[model samples]
Target chain A: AVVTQEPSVTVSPGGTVILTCGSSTGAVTSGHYANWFQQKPGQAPRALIFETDKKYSWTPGRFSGSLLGAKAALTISDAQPEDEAEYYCSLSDVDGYLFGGGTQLTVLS
Target chain B: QAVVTQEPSVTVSPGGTVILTCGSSTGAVTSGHYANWFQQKPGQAPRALIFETDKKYSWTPGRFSGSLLGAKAALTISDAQPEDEAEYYCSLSDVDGYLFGGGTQLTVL
Candidate 1:
């Protein structure tokens, strides 16, 4: 049993990583921007990047973003293990934020 | 659209200031736009943070606010708590940009 593509993400230590977040259980729709977040174990997830690569005043500088066509990019400068947990990308409408499952991150020693 | 990306986990000392992030491919987080935020747990709907950038939604605590940080949006937790530990996300509303970063983990040790 093998899974070709699942809700997955990749980030490097002391640097940033790219996460291609999508649906693993259904056909993802279009006409919506993308968003990213991370949650530590037993903790709630937090917002990192948003539409058209803009930052929330609540967000930090280490966390930045850019938008390209159907994809949005978020960058975390000076990565740390504290930067590992689970990441998910989702879509939204007028009602809610539809998630892209989640991506668990592992920091190498 | 390629919305935004984020790290999976972030751990900070209890009562410490922990920061979460949001970014996109389009531009920086401070681009005169609308970047909203939300909170999620196991099986729950998103709770609003910022609706239309810098506009604090009703009843939201002063601790929670949204704005463009750099190239991305961010949510900073002053004296982060174990309860503050959860999934957080951001959304953008420009040209109908509706998406969130994958997700982020915030752990308060």
Candidate 2:
């Protein structure tokens, strides 16, 4: 099954936005095992959230993860201009790991 | 915070072999880290190749393999093809969370 995400999202600076990740199969619970990553153009992706909501030591405090309804969600609170980039979510499947197409987040001033 | 390091770039002949490594500033990379490897091309989402250090996904190419080489995580590509010219990323998990390497740009000549 393929992982899905919004094509793009726009958020005003200092605002909040939620980007969602869904599985073609079913609801995304903790069992689905979600991971969130942030990538800027020409740079490698940085790990944001893992195992649903756990954040890394270097993960910014403004970013959070959760299971929102039938999907996994990454919430950027007080979004900043630097947050404008592609966000990707990966889910652990029975076969292996599946990656979302990625959501381009534009944080406008 | 954890710092995962990888070569900035590497070049290999179309039919040669190459090994890319991932190291952590924290300490030796072991099985407990559950190392994972990914491949990404321009304008595309990353594709999972190896997980749990050496396990390959169903879709993972047979030419690719993952393992722990001394204090680092290694990805070996045998008989590298031109299509293998892309960015390679490795991730390792700790008790805090997951961390991704800076990514290595592979050039298959």
Candidate 3:
């Protein structure tokens, strides 16, 4: 639950884009296991990062996640046109898991 | 993440009933998996529908319900409305990690 994901981030092809997220409750530090998800048009969401920085074996190496102080962060390096999609962050708490509002990234030519 | 399966698409008439299901490839989805479900529209982040398997969220509508159906987890929509048209995703968390279904597109005409 945070901002409007920088309101549509525009990045050139082969550039880098960083998406940020913060909770309405408290600091998203350790034990949060902040994970990132990518959803392409008309496609299901795919897991990019889990437990903060750990990536799935099949996930591309370009997507990385981290805990930036009180906020959870997702950084996509060497962004490609295929990376033009919506990114979401998810983490579990005592009540349950929470999903971020999502960031829409457009990779320009 | 192991392979989780969901229907590619489903359609129902307004005021009809529909069920979207999620199944695991490794084994039957059980309560130990902590099955959760989400609803997402085109431009918004996913909203939690059901959590901890069969427990609906506080904000979940009475027409929307969840349960374990044989080897899979099922989300049932009764008296479906046009506003209920959205992509439905199911996530199961185990000790190893979290696994999300490919997602099912529900179209309520």
Candidate 4:
């Protein structure tokens, strides 16, 4: 089965990577939508993506996502220090947001 | 940047009933969109009490129940016991972090 998850990356220099969430049955037929959220230390989680692969209202274009090959990928086009935070990927089956182990993004500046 | 409001502290007596509430300044608690409660004792991981409004999840004990009190989601402890002392937090899934109130320091005496 395909898996949805956010890839770990360094926050020091500018980097671009695809954070994928949701996966098809690997048979490439049955899969659900996936989304991502940005959560900082001591702060609440925010909605970043939902259905349609569009960015949340007022969200910077720097953080965006899309669906491909039975996967939902959250891409941070330009990495920055402020981007350092816990990143979690969620499946969109409404089972209540099950979170990943969480990526503790550290800014190396 | 929306602050979910919660009581910082609450004190109750044995056999007395205590009700804790969590609500948004911008919205009512009973809208049925989202609301959850968690109990965390000192040096313990959080335990789910109420999820999706009044539905208690698998791990929750019988004493714990969740309800929407007007515009807020609420957790009520029937027959308050000293063992019930812990930090209670209400969360609206819209935000990422499951926040707890300042925490209620309940004492049996």
What's the TM-score of each model vs. the native?
0.48, 0.60, 0.56, 0.56
The sequence of per-residue lDDT tens digits that candidate 4 reaches over residues A23-68 is 4444112133354668886777766664426554546688876765
lDDT, model 2, position A80: 93
lDDT of 1 by residue, B16-93 (tens): 876677777766766655666777766655656667667664545677766667777777777666777778777665
Q: Cα miss at A53, model 4 (Å)?
A: 18
- Clashes (backbone N, CA, C under 3 Å), per candidate, total 77, 0, 0, 6
User: What's the best-to-worst order under DockQ?
Assistant: 4, 2, 1, 3
lDDT score of model 2?
0.88
lDDT of 4 by residue, B5-107 (tens): 7788888888877888887766665453567676767766555567567986555667777887877777888788888888887776553333434555555
Q: Scored by CA lDDT, what does every candidate get?
A: 0.62, 0.88, 0.79, 0.63
Which regions of candidate 2 are displaced past 4 Å? B1-34, B37-69, B74-109
As for candidate 2, its interface RMSD to one decimal place is 6.3
By lDDT: ranked, best first: 2, 3, 4, 1
True contacts kept of 2: 0.05
What pairs collide in candidate 4?
A4-A22, A45-B96, A45-B97, B28-B71, B29-B71, B29-B72
Cα lDDT of model 1 by residue, A1-109, tens digit: 1111235555667766655544333333343345667667666466666562656556656766554333445556767777777766665543345666576766554
Ten consecutive residues with minimal summed lDDT in candidate 2 chain A? A90-99
**In candidate 1, residue B40 scores what lDDT?**
70
In order, the interface RMSDs are 10.8, 6.3, 7.7, 7.4
Among these predictions, the greatest TM-score belongs to 2
Off by over 4 Å in 3: A1-21, A24-109
Listed in order, the DockQ scores are 0.07, 0.11, 0.07, 0.15
